[model samples]
Target: MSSEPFIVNGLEGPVLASLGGNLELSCQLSPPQQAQHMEIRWFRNLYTEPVHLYRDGKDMFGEIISKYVERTELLKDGIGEGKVTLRIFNVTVDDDGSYHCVFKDGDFYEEHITEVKIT
Candidate 1:
């Protein structure tokens, strides 16, 4: 797998009782040549849509939907290189689903899924 152009993986934050509890997910991305100003989005499965998208170390607030308003978070280890991490704060039951971390660069779009189960 290391020989591939890039790699994608998932990790979730600890679940809690309230909406203020923190939730996290990450994508391990290794660009062929340092992806400058990359685009990454975390979605609730391939069928649905993104819960959060991160670019240049910040969250694209306007791109986020109302379903995740005031409940999702975006986290990044850095801007143009290394693993891109996503985190959601104030999670709710509505967030329970399968998530996909998508990374796109020019013609290449790679995504990996993570499952978030909330009771």
Candidate 2:
């Protein structure tokens, strides 16, 4: 069976040292219903706004992100069937922190958070 979907799941990658490992964060939409009308956003813990937006499988990056991550992309295509994966490459010591995925449909919303622990 596939892994259980976390409301927010933390992923450790490449380096097993943990402190310097890369992170792949993900979350599923809320209510356990159809995701047809959801607008998904991924954000850094320091900001109140999103770094990535997924709507209709297209990613829109807002202007508030750090230059190191401004080129980040949202893997939106797999979301409707309940998979939303955020892949970040070449992670650094500064990347060891909390991240969030927020989903909204009209006034309805759900948010999940994950922490990256870099050894």
Candidate 3:
């Protein structure tokens, strides 16, 4: 009867990226499990929409908003161990703020917040 799984953040400090640079944010399942089928989202502020999204065993490009469109992706290289990463291809000052990394499985969900400070 597993419901929700604990999500853990991997950022050690304030996230930062130079002008037009790449940035990455990471999180994991505390107990570790296969997360390929889960919906992983990296969104800003709220959950209304996602900056980066992964669902149905693949990345969801059309779901990302205009600003984040083609600028971000869900890197699931470590998904086998429940680790999830989001990469921003061209970081901008407008991207500075808090990001919510959330993992959703069926009717369950969990999230970790990370703040970014672009340099």
Candidate 4:
């Protein structure tokens, strides 16, 4: 299959993490283009529930998953630089799994997945 126009930090190689430590899943747009006008989303396995979402040039929290409600955040200012990192504070075992980062701009959309292992 072909690849997406995004880079997922942990997926580039094996990623190790601590149980209680904070985790930042990095997903940046390729070509280093601005993503302020794009739709960014971070989900785990299921798309219905999102870990983080940025739409209409702002972060949308209303539809965020319960498990990541206050524990997740997106670097609002970083979007201009195509840096979309899903910050998970005080990580736990439940946070370990495959994560997908999606980006959409006009008629174009791309997605990439990464795994997290708790050590």
Local accuracy of candidate 4 as per-residue lDDT tens digits, 40-119: 76656445655555675565666555656566666646767666766776666665776666777545677776577787
| lDDT values, one for every candidate | 0.57, 0.54, 0.66, 0.63
Question: lDDT tens string, model 3, 4-83?
Answer: 35556565336776767778766766534566666777756345554555685565556645556677666776777767
TM-score comparison, 1 vs 2, better candidate: 1
lDDT of 4 at 65: 54
> 1 or 4, which is superior by TM-score?
4
Backbone clashes in model 2, listed as residue pairs = 18-119, 19-118, 19-119
Colliding pairs, model 1: 19-90
The candidate maximizing lDDT is: 3
| Local accuracy of candidate 1 as per-residue lDDT tens digits, 1-119 | 45465655444433233455666665666676465566777656234344555555456655554455665555554434566555666655665556666787645667775666564
Minimum summed lDDT over a 10-residue window in model 3 is located at: 4-13
> How many residue pairs in model 2 have overlapping backbones?
3
What TM-score, over all chains together, does every model reach? Answer: 0.62, 0.59, 0.72, 0.67
Kindly report which residue stretches of model 1 are placed more than 4 angstroms away from their true locations once superposed. 1-5, 9-19, 45-54, 57-62, 65-67, 70-72, 79-81
Order the numbered candidates by TM-score, best leading: 3, 4, 1, 2
lDDT of each residue in 23-115, candidate 2, tens digit only: 455665533555655677665545545465556545555634454454455666556666666665555666555666676654556676556
Q: Native-vs-model 4 lDDT? A: 0.63
Q: Look at candidate 4 and give me any clashing residue pairs.
A: none
How far out, in Å, is residue 5 in model 1? 4.2
